[model samples]
Each structure stands twice: as structure tokens, then as C-alpha cells.
Target: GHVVAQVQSVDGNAQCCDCREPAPEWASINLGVTLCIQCSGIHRSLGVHFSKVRSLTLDSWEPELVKLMCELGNVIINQIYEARVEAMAVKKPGPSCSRQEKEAWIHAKYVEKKFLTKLPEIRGSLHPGALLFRASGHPPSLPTMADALAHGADVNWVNGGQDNATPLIQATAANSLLACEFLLQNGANVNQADSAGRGPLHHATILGHTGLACLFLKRGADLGARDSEGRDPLTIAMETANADIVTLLRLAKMREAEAAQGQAGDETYLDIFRDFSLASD
Candidate 1:
């Protein structure tokens, strides 16, 4: 499926999340909800810091990034983002609502996060990092992860376990792509290594998750990071015969080299990866 159709297939993704407007063509990348352009315009005013808005029809969607939007769609995210709207008797905007009304609501809903589920008044001695790590995997729950973050969880918490694996590392090992996306949205560090000195980039290749390799590489995962065994991702890809991973690594390596020499990275380099993700090796 094309990116648009693939995303709209997710539960409740076919409509504008804020107003139930049908066939919305815009989306908030970090929030994973479709929006009508009217809503899109309002979201734009909120700044990318508040919500990274893009046109689903207009923007060139990366296949892996489209995955980030799909795993949790409007139904799941709205339940969390709008958790308290009904409790507080707030009337959500309708499709016909004036721009001002929708703008005000968008500002209130996301900028203030006014309707997010309130955390339990008493957390029972749970360390935020551990909670984030636990929420990151061992049976992932993005909702709880969000809760942990709200309660001050570290996005890059290093577990006290001997390996000292951060939440991103744990998410990688667990193969929880959505958990990784959740952490990334909250500013997860892509370059942290575990006690064994393996970063998520290394873990992705070792696990044979080609899409995640592209995912990590786009986030600036250290291509040059070597494990305790002294091997970079490029070398590992060659050893494993992960042909596409080799392509991704080499492209990223070339871009890294070019950028170091003050040459701007070519946009088509990324286009190559997107097509590969659509049909990975």
C-alpha cells in the first residue's frame, strides 16, 4: 500500500482526530493522528515543538516513519490525549467549527496537554527510569511509558541491570519498534551503548530488523560506533550478508563523510532508503 492508504488503515486514522472530520489529509507525526487542513493550520501555529504537523498527502512519507504513525492510531492516542475531555464535559470541536474554535481547542488540547490522563496521586516508590524501561519492553505499553514520562521518567534511562541498557537499547532488543518511536518522540538518545558496548544500531543489524536499521540511521545513530568486539555497523552488515543493511550503512557512511567535508547531503540518498524499506532485503 502507499503511505496514505497504509496509515488510514489503522483504527480511527481515516478521520480528523480532533473533529471526526472524514478523510483528513494532514497528520501530526509525533502524535500519530490525521487532521483536516483546518486543524493542520492550527497545529502549525503550535510549533513543531508542540506537534510536528505534516500533510499526509503532500509530504513525502518515509515507509518506516509511516510505521511510526500506524502502530498506535487515533483510537489509542486520542484515548490518552483526550482522556479527560469527557470527564471534564468539554465539547470537542466539530468539522464546521470556526478556525478560532478549532485553534483554541488545538492549543488547549496539545499545548497544555490539558486532557491527558492525570497520573495516580501516589506512585509507589517506582523509579521513573525503571518504569520507563519496563514500559519500554518486557511487554510494551506505550500508555504506561507516556505515564512514566509524565511522572518524570528519563527517556534514556540506563537500567541498573549489569548490562546498563538504556530504554532505547531495551526497546531495540525487545524489537518494540513503537516503543522506540515513543521514546524517540520524547527525545531518546540514539547513540547510547549498553554495558557490552552495543548501541541500538548494532542491535538492529544483529536482530536482522532492516526497517529499524533505517529508523536508527535517520535518527543519527552512530554508524562509527563499534562494539567491544571492535566492529562498526557497516562491517557487521557485510559479515552478516545483510545486503540492504549494507546499502543503508554505506549510504549513511558516505553522507557522514560528505557532511564532514562541508558537502551537503543529497536528498535522493534518503529516497533510496524509503523505497528499500517498502521492500527490504
Candidate 2:
């Protein structure tokens, strides 16, 4: 749902002072007015107060530079990626941190404040895969949900409005890798169970997002976690015919089992076999 806002003047305001085109590359002109898709995305991403692109008139911009400006967005995308990676690496584990240290480490991530507005108010459930954090709503994303953690958003704070879910659950359910990574870095509990007794692993399995399944596994989301029905992530993935997911889950399980056995020092393979055989009998 992108909107192409049109400008209303043909005076000095009407002509794109920068480009003398009927419309700017980011915007188009129809019936002498112009607007563009990047403008819409920016509005969605950062909100209207931050956007600089204007939509005053078709005559404001030159048509020749449209292509150049259109490609400018790709540069912005690159910048976003660059910033995201830097943010991710800020807390990425280093050699100094042992596996046990990594497991025990917790960090301050996000901070946010809450307020109630509008008397006699009612609310609707958020679409699982849609944006849950809004400027308004009971389970709404707090004003600071997306802000820097040191400022006020609780990075590890679980959302109580829906099934005791963390931001990671919502991100995985939405299949937003960027969001998932951001949450994980901020200390979101990837293994924590939601209202349905499902963790991020189950969400990845049910959604068939194989890459997310791998990410969760890498973060130590328990592959052995069971849902209300006693189905683990691997079993759920198999039931859904998610070959890639099942493969990854089984691989994680195998590695985990091997590591456990490796940790069991002074026990021979035959001794382990005998112990299992006796239990079976």
C-alpha cells in the first residue's frame, strides 16, 4: 500500500527547484502532481517527520536526473546493511568469551515507557506476521521499542499482552531476519516458550523458514523443546514435510548428543551400548 502524494502548485513552489522534470525519480507526476515509492517506504520505515523528499508539484523537478536519483536508493540500502552489521558485531562473541560465558552473558538492550490513552477504549489482536508495535494499542510496540537500549527499550523485556512473548518470537513469526538478529544481539530469549508452549524453533518449523531454523539452532534454541502436544521442533518440521528444517534440527541434535557423549569421560562405547541395552530389556 504505497501512496504517491501529489503536489498542488505550479508556481516557484510548483517547479522542482532541483530538477526541472514533470516528476522526480522517487515521485511521479500525473495531472501535474508527483510522488514516489521510496518516499512511501521511508515514511513507513522512519515516519513522516524525518522524510525530506517533497511533493509540491510536477514542475518542481527535472526529468533527466530521474534515473540517477532512482539508483540512489540502492546506496541507502547498502548503508542500512552496513549499519546493521556493525550493530550485530557489537556484541558478537569473541575468543575471550568461553562457551559457558556466552551462555551466561546478558546485556542491557532496549528500554521503553508505557501510557494509556483514549477513554473507554477497545483493541484488536495484532496479525502475527504483521507489525505489532504501533504508536497505539494494548500490546502495542512501545514508543521506545525500536530505540537504542541505553535510552529506554527493554531489549529482554517480554511482551505481556500476547502469550508472554518476547520480541524475538514476534520477529521469527514474521520471518524478519534483520529483526531476529537485532533482537538476539539485545539478549532476547530465543528458547523461551510463548503462550502456545512453542519457542522460536517451533515458529521457524511451522513457518518453514529454514534459514531461521538454522539461526535459532546456532543460538542454542532447544531442539528438544516440546509443544503442548509433546511434539518437538524436529517432529513438527517432519510432520510439515520441511525437509531442510528437519535436516538442520537433526544435525543440531546429533552434534549435541555427540558433545554430551564426548563429555562423558572414562566411558567406553561398549559400556554405553550395554547400559542402553539393559535399559531396553
Candidate 3:
């Protein structure tokens, strides 16, 4: 069951609801049920389960509640991608709990594993902190990404500030294992390309992320998908000295793609020309 976490008050005319971003126009007093974006994000993070969550009634809106928003923007904006600020306490193992050592305690953990059962519901490819937006250089949050998804955000979302990248490109470039997994699971296109015609697989191979490469392979990602330069995932893998990953990708069969609607391109195994030059007999 979802918790009815917290409610907040707005100035109704002047002050914003303690949010970093400007309030949406509908958040003004005239709307019967209005909530600032920050407060709305909090509600979603708590899993309120609404297509939209704002109303005047206490059962729905709860306008008088007040505290602090716990500002996820800080951890995200400061590049703390894997930690939440609220996770700053040591739960000591005392009395009947000498089974676990004090040194084994952790102060913070990923919100997905610790607080929520699953991801906060990411919809689009680009998320805050983890992505460089093509538009206005705005930073977005994992929660915001999920909220955007909840509100029917576009899955093929892309942007091009100076670099022009999709969410997939950013995650692959950074080699963020967890972020990549989250995006992929939430329907991000695994075969999408970056500005220079590099796909996530190219970056994964270049960076030697064998695990991520394998995951992408299993998820129907195109091994033969060409970048702007016509470089395939296999070529990139071999050129970057990722023999094991190249081998893994070559040996792997496209299970999801084969079983799904579309057919894979007729590209041969990744190692048509094995590099005996680097191998010893």
C-alpha cells in the first residue's frame, strides 16, 4: 500500500512551495487542487499512485502539512548519483544483535534498494544528475525522470545542447552500471546513437564494461547497429582491446529480440577475423 506521506502549504499568491524550480502556473491559488512541483515529486517518490496528485480536499491534497522536502536536488546536482541524503544514520547493532559487526554498517544506500522496492518509475532516457540535457542545461533527477514517465513522458526523448545526446549515450559514456540497467529496463532504446554515431554498446566495449555489454546483448541491442561513422558494436569492441567482451557478444544469441516481434539484422558473428596477433599458441 502507498503511504500518504506529507502535505505542504503554499503562499497561495506569492511564495513558492520551497522548491528549487519555479512553480507551475496551475499551482496558483485559483486551482482547486494545487501543489508545487517539489511537493508533488515527494508524493510520487512515496508511491501515492496517481496519474496526477493535486486536490483541495485533505483526503487528497493535505495543504497544511509542513517540514522539509529533504532536497534530492543537492545530492543529484553535486554528482552524488548513488547516495541519498536521508540515508545518513548508523543503525547500530546492539544487545541481541552482535551477529553483525559495527564495521559492516553502511550509512547510505541506493534509494531503489533501500527505500523503494523498485525504481521510482523512470520514463525517458535522460535523468537528472546522470545526464547532460540538450536543452537549457537543466539538471534532472532520477525521481523526476520517473515522474515524467508516470505522466506519460516520451520514451524516445533526446536532446542536443552542444553535445546532443540521448539518455542512453550518457549512461554508456559514464559506465554507470545501475543507471544503465534502470534505463534499459524502463524501455530506453538500447540501439540509440550518440552525436559521433557511437551507441551505448560502443562506449560499453571501449570502457571494458563486460557485464553491461552482456546485458545489452541479452536485451536485443543491435550488435551491427552503425554509428555516424558506420562503426559496428563488434568493431568497436575489438579495436578497444575488449577480447573477452567481443567473444561474449559473439557467442551470445539474441534471445529477447528473436522471441519478440522484430527480426535481427543479418550480421555475422562478431569475430569473423579473430585477432591471433594478440594471442599466444
Candidate 4:
């Protein structure tokens, strides 16, 4: 009756215990974690020899099942499943980490038991995905992030009490160039905003992530988008005294204008722009 709905509401912030996807209705009963439909399919392929699968709504629940759902939520399950991941140099995936990544990761976790052999190390109890996102701010975090994504971490995962912000924004805030590149290449939403309506581009300018700001422009980020305060990226950059970013953003605007004016060919213009941008580096 109310159990399914109640459980869902309680676990609303929880992602699939495997991939950091939004947990909908599926559950891996024996493993004691919720799963996205995709990860659940992978679990099923492992056969009941390893785990049992059930639906929170489709299956008739025993009182024990209800209690189990109440007890072993995603975070608690990660304490068991993802234990010792940090020491292993494992990167948990962000929300934007693709599905193929999750499949491979789940296979390695359960079938190969790759991480099972590592000794558990105690540390801060961050959401495994959030932990990976935070890690993306450091050097050499891309490979870690790749592992995390393959293991079903979401690239777009927003953290608790952070106003539904994203990893891209955080990377920009921290001035993580490689991290920002990885996120962009992996399909992070360039136009996504924080609690203040400032997007990744806006944050990049404000924080003076000069390289990241250029990357955003190359990736088609809105150069003229206004933030919640009605300030544009240029305005923010000027206010922050980031002359470099201001200059770069102005160039991006000029390029856009040239493209819009139907000069030569748009494709050729983009190619030249990209080549020139790369050569300038």
C-alpha cells in the first residue's frame, strides 16, 4: 500500500546502488540496494545464482521486504559495495557517466569481483558519486572519473544542500582544466546553472578558469546568457577583474557574430576558429 510510495520518497535522493542513476522502482533484494532499470538488467543477467531482483511496486512484498528496504538504502549499501574504493584509486561515476560505462563497471564489481579483494578503509561517508565529482577537481582525476563513470557514477550528479549544482560547475569553480575537459567531452550540460542561475560559463569567468572558459565557448556555451542577477558572463568577468576571460569571451562573441553573418562557410569558420584557438594555446 503506502509502503512502496513511502520507500520511494525516502530514497528519492538515492541513486542506483550500482550506477548513480536515479533509482526508480527496481531493487536488488539480496544485495540490499536500489538500481536503475539499466543496472537492474545487468544484475538479472548475472542470474539468481548471484542475486535476486524484484520491483518495489510490481512484486508482492512481505513485511520483511519492507523492513529491508527501510534498512539497506543506497548509501548504506555503498558503505559495503564501494568500501575501500578510495584506496583502490577507483573513481566513482558521475550522473553523466554513460550506460556502457555502468555495464562494464557492474560486471567488474560483481562478476570479476575486482574491488571485492581490496581491504576496506574508513573515511568520510560521502556519496560515492559526489566523492568522484569532488575528485575531478584534482589532477589525474580523469581516469578516476572514467572508472567511476564505468561503475555507474553520474557525471551530472548534484550533491546534497548544494542547490542542485553539477560537477562541471564545481570543476570550473576549482579551476580544474582536465576535469572540465573530461566533463565536457562526456556530455556535461554546459548551460546548466547553480542555485544562483549562474551557469558553468558564468562560474568559469567569475573564477577565472581561463582555459575552461575557452573550452566552454568552443563547446557552444551561450556567450550572452544572463544569470539570475541579470549579469552576463562578460559583466561578471569585468566585475571580477578577469581581463583575460573578458578578452576571450569577447573573441567568442566576435566569432559567433562572424558565423551568424554567413561568412564563407560556417563549418570552415568553426574549423578555423578551433584551429586558431588550439594554436593559441
Candidate 5:
């Protein structure tokens, strides 16, 4: 319940990430920023595809989601999302600004993306998909991925030279939950497998990445999906003896059944993932 406090404790989140209004109560889960209510309304109108808005106080939050916000707030995200703001002289909206200014700034900052750094070489790369595949690893930068996407790189673009692994799988291989989430938010298929039939879930379990396994489960990954050896994610979890993931896979299986019958299942499944995210940072 006090997760809001935990998130706000991150540096540079005391004010609305957009207009700089103090005491931001809304957040864009995907973008990882706080927003004033006014900015939040504008973000909502822009659509979830661009900014996934949620109330810090109103929406029930999972620990993983909360941790994502805490990991990157205004300072870190703005450095990527607003890289050229100062050099380009884009006016930073102040708290007293009119709605029109705030709206315009928000639109420019995120929707039109007038401030994100330009990576012409990456954008013009013959295989922008390959650019993103490699960039998704190591230090996962959201803006880089956004640039590739804007230039028409396929979100699920596979690396042919690397076992036909998608960007999401590559991110998982990099052990980056943030990278995986960003790819999924941009339309990477959760259940999509590589040449070896190892989907993100299968790879996560095999790698003993319990946090990623939980994320894949929550994102509707298919538990029955089998890899090259016909081993499903659950079997791999058991085979690897990752006790945490084995439990998570079985719990997600039960939750899947409940969803099939129209009941949304329990919150307990998400609770098991709490420690993983806390430790991620």
C-alpha cells in the first residue's frame, strides 16, 4: 500500500515529470515517470500505446510495476526522452502554465517526440531490427528502442544470425526486465519462440530468472508452450530446479485456468514476485 512512497523516493520525482508541478500523483507505468493530474489527463488522451497512465493511489499495483517506476524517474527518463530539450530550447512548462502550454509540451515531449535524441545511423541501418536487437542488451536504453521503433523496426524483429531470437528474447538473454517490458509494450509477442522454440518464458525459466518468469506469466505467456525438446516453461523450471520459478509457473497455470472460467484469480501470484523486483535495483 505504501509502494507509492517507495516509488516517489526515487530521485527527481518530487514534481510532475511533465510540467514540473509539485506533488505528482499519477504515473506512466511504461514510460516510468510521474505526472501531475493535468499532465496525466493529457497522457491518457494520447493513448496507452504511447503512455500507460495509472493512479499512484487509485490503481492496485504489483511490486514489479512499482519497482519499474522507482528504477527510473524524471531525471533518468528525461535524460533519454528529453535529450535535446535544453539544446533545442524547448520551453520547460512550469506549474503555473496554462493547460494549452502543458498539453502542447506533453504532446511534443512524448507523442511527437520532438526531443528524443536522433540516431540517424541506427535509424538508417539496413536492418534497424538488428540494431535494436543488439541495443536491447547491455545497458537497456528506452529512447534507443523508441528511435528504432519510430523508424519502422519491427518490435518482434528476429536476429537471424542468433537463433532467430526476437528483441524480447534478446532482452531476456541480457537479463533485463526493463528491456523485456519495453519491447512488450511496443508489441513484442510474449509467446513468440525463437528458432529453437524457446519463447521468453522458456528462456527465463531455463536461465533461472524468476522475475522475468513472473513478468512473462503476468503478460499471458503460454505455460503449455514447449521449446526444442518439447519442454514447457514449467518443466524447464522444474528441470533447472529453480524453486521460485517452479512455484511461479504452477501458480500462473492455476491463474490461467481461473481466467479461462471468467474469474480473475488471486493476487498471491504477483506477491511472489515482490522480492525479485526489489532486488533488481
Candidate 6:
């Protein structure tokens, strides 16, 4: 039986209970909910004293564990944890919530018991962080971005201070793979255009970030996107002398065509594409 499917049969949202990002594999069976890797780490950090973390794919599970997961899914747990969201001092983590924000929020929810009571209203600024933020691909930027996201920062917010570039655009330009992956997993639009009409794919290709380019393609970036200069990602790659990127894009395009023609099945394409060098040939 499919473990994920079984868990989904009960709490089929298929999103991380803590961050709400798409979680394909990981789960905290002890917590009775699925989680994203980021949140899974925090759960594990709390140690088995608070929660036990396990892999849906790697760990062995019993029928009883499955039943427990079914019984204590996100909704049930949230009712107990987030019952008074409006009254809570710390806001719940949204898609853009940063690593620091998640750590504090998760700690408050599970350990501190700070939100259990609906305290007297303390009037103050309702919002936190900047309206538009930029990440420099610096080591600190990752957690900074996460904190901004946690405090309700817009992942797609454009910064005119920096030419209206979104976080994803900045991340691609900075070659911050971790930030890029975090933004993508949290629903940042891969096709979102900057003020220059260039998207993440364009930036990745121009910067010769082959891995980021492949990530964008795998995330369904529009390879055909044209910038204000009327240059597509392919054109940009060629201009930058990115032979490897050019080859990958060509193979992906070829795969698209083959799939459309019913000549390429998922397993077949995946088998070839699994090895980028093989796909290029």
C-alpha cells in the first residue's frame, strides 16, 4: 500500500502541517501529520521529548502508526494548537515565513503554550518586516528571507529600490540555490516577470546558473518567455556562452515535443532526463 496515499486518505491536503508547503514525502507520524523538510528539521530539533520525526519513504511504519496519523491530522491538531489565531501575539507562518519565524512559531505552538490563552488585546502595529525585500545570496540572507516570509512578507513583492526584482529574481541573480529552492517550494511564481520583463529562467540562463536553470525547467518555467529585449531564455543562454544550459533546454524542448506526440512516456522521459548528460546526447 502507498504510505503517502494512506496518509492522504485521512489528511489529503498533502502540505506540511507547519509551513503549508507542498510535502511529497516527509511526515511526522508521531505528530500525526506530514511536513516539509524545513519544518521536519525543527520538529526533530525539539527532540523526541516533544515529537518524533520519521520519513514516509525511509522509515518503517506500522498499521497502528497509519491509524494514529489518520486520527490526529492537521485540522484536529490545529484546533488544539491554533484555536485562537486571532488572539495570538505571533502571527501564524504563511508561505513567506522565514526560518527564524518558523522556529519561534513552532516552539510557541508546541512547547511554550503561549497561545493557549486568549489574552487581553494589546494594540500595536499589526504587520512586521519590509514591504519589498532583496536577498544577496549571502549566508544570512536565507534566514532573513525566511523571517520576512514568516511575518507575512510577500514572496512575489517587487522592489523598485532594486529595479522591481522579486525575491526569486534576486535569488537567481545571486545564485542562492537554497533561497531559490525555498521560494519555489513556497509557491513563488517561476514565471513572474521583473520590471525588465525578465523572469527567473532568463536570469538563471544569463548568469549561467546551469543547476538553477534546470531547477526552473523542472519547476515548469516557460522556456519560451521573451524579455523586454525580445530574447528568449535560449537566446540568453547562447549569448552567455552557456553550452551546457543550451543543451539541456534543447533536450527538454525535445522531450516536450516527444511527449506531445505520444512517443515519450513519463517513465521513459524520466529515465533519460534523470541523467542530464544522457539527455544532452
Query: Which candidate has the top score in TM-score?
Result: 5
Q: Candidate 4, residue 19: CA error in Å?
A: 26
- lDDT of each model, Cα atoms only? 0.78, 0.45, 0.43, 0.66, 0.78, 0.67
* CA shift of 180, model 6, Å: 0.8
Number of backbone clashes in candidate 3 = 6
Best to worst by TM-score, what's the order?
5, 1, 6, 4, 2, 3
Residues 1-281, candidate 2: write the lDDT tens digits.
11222122222222222122233334322111122333323333432222234443323443212322232222222222123434445443333445343232211110111111112111222222223322112243321233222223354545676676766777666665555654564456788887778888888788887666766776788878888999999889789876666666776776678778875423333223323332111
CA deviation > 4 Å runs, candidate 4 = 1-126, 264-281
User: Which TM-score value belongs to model 1?
Assistant: 0.77
Error of 4 at 155 (Å): 1.3
- Pairwise lDDT winner, candidates 3 and 6: 6
Q: Which run of 10 residues does model 2 get worst, by summed lDDT? A: 106-115
Off by over 4 Å in 5: 120-131, 138-154, 238-247, 262-264, 273-281
Clashing pairs in 3: 121-146, 128-140, 134-161, 160-164, 197-227, 197-228
Taking the tens digit of each residue's C-alpha lDDT, what string does model 1 give over 1-281? 37778888887898899888888888888677788888888888888766788877778976556877877678877776777899899999998988888888888787787886655122222576787787777577766676566556678888766678888878887777678887887778898888878899998888777767777888899999989999989888889887778888888888888899977886756556746565332
Model 4 agreement with the true structure over 11-52: per-residue lDDT tens digits: 532567776777457886655567777778888888774457
Candidate 6 residue pairs that clash: 96-149, 96-150, 97-149, 97-150, 98-146, 98-147, 98-150
Query: lDDT by residue for model 3 over 83-104, one digit each (tens)?
Result: 3333644342332333223113
> 1-281, model 5: which lDDT tens digit per residue?
59677777788898999888887889988678898899999998898778888899889886556766776688876775677888997689899999999889888888787886665243225666877887787677655665566545788898776689888988888888778877876778999999999999888887887778778877889889877898998888787767777777777777778888987886565654646554321
lDDT of 4 at 2: 68
What clash count goes with each model? 0, 24, 6, 18, 0, 7
How much does each candidate deviate from the true structure in C-alpha RMSD? 4.3, 19.7, 18.1, 16.8, 3.9, 12.6
